[PDB]
Amino acid sequence: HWGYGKHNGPEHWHKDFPIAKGERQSPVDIDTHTAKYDPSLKPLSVSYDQATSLRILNNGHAFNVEFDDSQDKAVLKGGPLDGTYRLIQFHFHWGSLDGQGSEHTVDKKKYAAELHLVHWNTKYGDFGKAVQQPDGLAVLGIFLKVGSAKPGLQKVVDVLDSIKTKGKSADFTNFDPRGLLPESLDYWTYPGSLTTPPLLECVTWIVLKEPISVSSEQVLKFRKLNFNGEGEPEELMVDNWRPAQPLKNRQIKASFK
Numbered sequence: 619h620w621g622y623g624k625h626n627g628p629e630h631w632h633k634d635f636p637i638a639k640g641e642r643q644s645p646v647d648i649d650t651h652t653a654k655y656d657p658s659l660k661p662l663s664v665s666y667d668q669a670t671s672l673r674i675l676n677n678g679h680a681f682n683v684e685f686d687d688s689q690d691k692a693v694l695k696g697g698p699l700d701g702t703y704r705l706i707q708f709h710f711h712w713g714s715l716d717g718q719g720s721e722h723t724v725d726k727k728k729y730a731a732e733l734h735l736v737h738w739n740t741k742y743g744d745f746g747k748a749v750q751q752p753d754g755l756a757v758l759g760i761f762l763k764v765g766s767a768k769p770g771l772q773k774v775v776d777v778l779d780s781i782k783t784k785g786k787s788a789d790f791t792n793f794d795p796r797g798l799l800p801e802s803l804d805y806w807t808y809p810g811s812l813t814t815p816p817l818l819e820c821v822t823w824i825v826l827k828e829p830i831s832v833s834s835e836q837v838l839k840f841r842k843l844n845f846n847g848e849g850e851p852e853e854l855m856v857d858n859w860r861p862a863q864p865l866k867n868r869q870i871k872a873s874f875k
C-alpha cells in the first residue's frame with residue numbers, strides 16, 4: 619500500500635495512480651517573482667463561526683480533524699472560487715526536522731509543516747462526488763514555522779497521545795479552527811490535485827502567504843505519532859509530505875502586490 623517509505627513513497631505512487639504524472643499535480647513550488655498579481659481576485663471569505671468539529675482520526679498518513687459537513691456551517695467562499703465550499707476536515711503534513719515538512723514551497727523554501735483545511739463544493743452534494751470534478755475541492759494551505767507557540771493549536775496537540783496509531787480516533791468537539799489562521803488572508807492560487815493517492819485533479823489551491831508560528835514542543839508532539847497500527851513495529855509519523863511537482867501549463871496568481 620502507498621505511504622512515505624523508501625519502497626512505497628511518492629516516487630512509487632504513479633504505478634498504482636498514473637495521474638501522479640498528470641498535468642495539474644500538487645504540491646508545487648511557488649516562485650514568488652513569477653506569480654502574477656491578479657486584481658480581479660477577491661478577498662477570501664472564511665466563515666468558521668458555526669464550525670462543528672466532531673472527531674480526530676489517525677488514518678495512517680496524517681491525523682484528520684473532521685467536521686459536520688451536513689449543513690453550511692463552516693464555509694469558504696470568494697477569492698478565486700465560484701460558489702460555496704464546506705469544511706470537511708483539516709490535517710497537517712510535517713517533517714522529521716524543522717527544516718522540512720511542507721508540501722508547497724516558496725522560492726524553494728520548505729516550512730516545518732503545512733496545514734490543509736479541506737472544503738468541498740456544495741453544488742456537487744457530497745465530498746465523494748466533488749472529488750470527481752475539476753472544481754470540486756478548495757484547500758486552504760497554511761505554512762507552519764517554528765518559533766512562538768500557537769495557542770489555538772494546543773488542544774489538537776494534547777489529544778494526540780490518544781490517537782497514537784493508525785485507525786485510532788477520539789471525540790474532538792468544540793474545536794475552533796479560527797485559532798489556526800494567520801492575521802493576513804493574502805494568498806496564492808492555482809489549479810491542482812490531492813497530494814495523496816488517489817491524487818485526483820479536483821483542487822483549487824489557496825495558499826496563504828503568511829505562516830503561522832508553532833513551538834518546537836508542539837511540532838515535536840506531531841512527530842510522536844505512528845504510521846503503524848497498535849501492536850505493529852513502531853514507525854514514527856514524520857515526513858508525510860509529497861515533494862513539489864512540475865508546474866506544467868499552469869500560472870500561479872497572487873491576491874496581493
Ligand SMILES: [Zn+2]
Nearest residue numbers: 709711734813
Ligand atoms: Zn494535505
